[PDB]
Amino acid sequence: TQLPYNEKWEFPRNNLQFGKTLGAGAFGKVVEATAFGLGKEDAVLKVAVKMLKSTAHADEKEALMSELKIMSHLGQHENIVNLLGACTHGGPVLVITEYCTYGDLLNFLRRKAEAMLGPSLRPLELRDLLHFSSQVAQGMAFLASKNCIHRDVAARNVLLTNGHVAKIGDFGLARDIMNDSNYIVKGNARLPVKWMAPESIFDSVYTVQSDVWSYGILLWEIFSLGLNPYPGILVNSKFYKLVKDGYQMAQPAFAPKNIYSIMQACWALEPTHRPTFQQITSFLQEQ
């Protein structure tokens, strides 16, 4: 980001055949597409393409390029949404990432729960939630090894692909956060407050451990099967005070006592005392 962009990621834009729009923000969107002759193997693949809408401004053009430059210098990991190519010459910027078959984790969890309650006219096992949690932890630990701060870790930014493997991603400009109830007004920007660490809300500081906090909130979403954090509590000055003073969500319905203990560790008031994603990973690989 704010550095030269490598041309190894360039891809012919007329070699994309676009399909349905997957997500749409205020000034950007992710669209599914079939890419032909992508990669060394010249694979023909279904992919996700990220692009700005017709309402194009200078500030929105930089935001997509920044996301691309960070992803380019990042590297490949099985449990993150990998970059496959970009279209930077010949027209509007297109960011080509892998296509995850099952969408985000939040809807998958919320649907499977509804399908599992069908006798109110496959199923999800506890092992499945431990694999989802383990997999995202591996992705975050990989970002933590590159000093790359996600700063919106949430189930809505975790995607499931072939074999229901979890990948951490970021819709960024392609989520309509303007109208999203999980993003609260805070002046110049709209922020996912209920996922944020207190020092990010007040000091506006983002680190690996601030992502560890939000990952702790993610664990609460996974093991509640898509419940909303701090449910029914309106984000206001009392909520800020409670979070800063040490208020924590109760144990979700389906988390073992030691998964809730790992949640509480991610929700420590002091950032250095929170676990690392490597420690979260290694623990969750056991479970």
Ligand SMILES: Cc1nc(-c2cnc(NC(C)C)n(C)c2=O)ccc1Oc1ccnc(-c2cnn(C)c2)c1
């Ligand atoms: C979620 C997502 N994320 C990124 C992305 C990831 N990672 C970073 N950055 C790192 C450094 C964390 N950035 C900046 C990003 O933009 C790009 C596109 C994207 O969208 C997708 C991707 C796959 N599949 C779908 C989908 C939707 N529905 N279905 C059925 C499939 C949507």
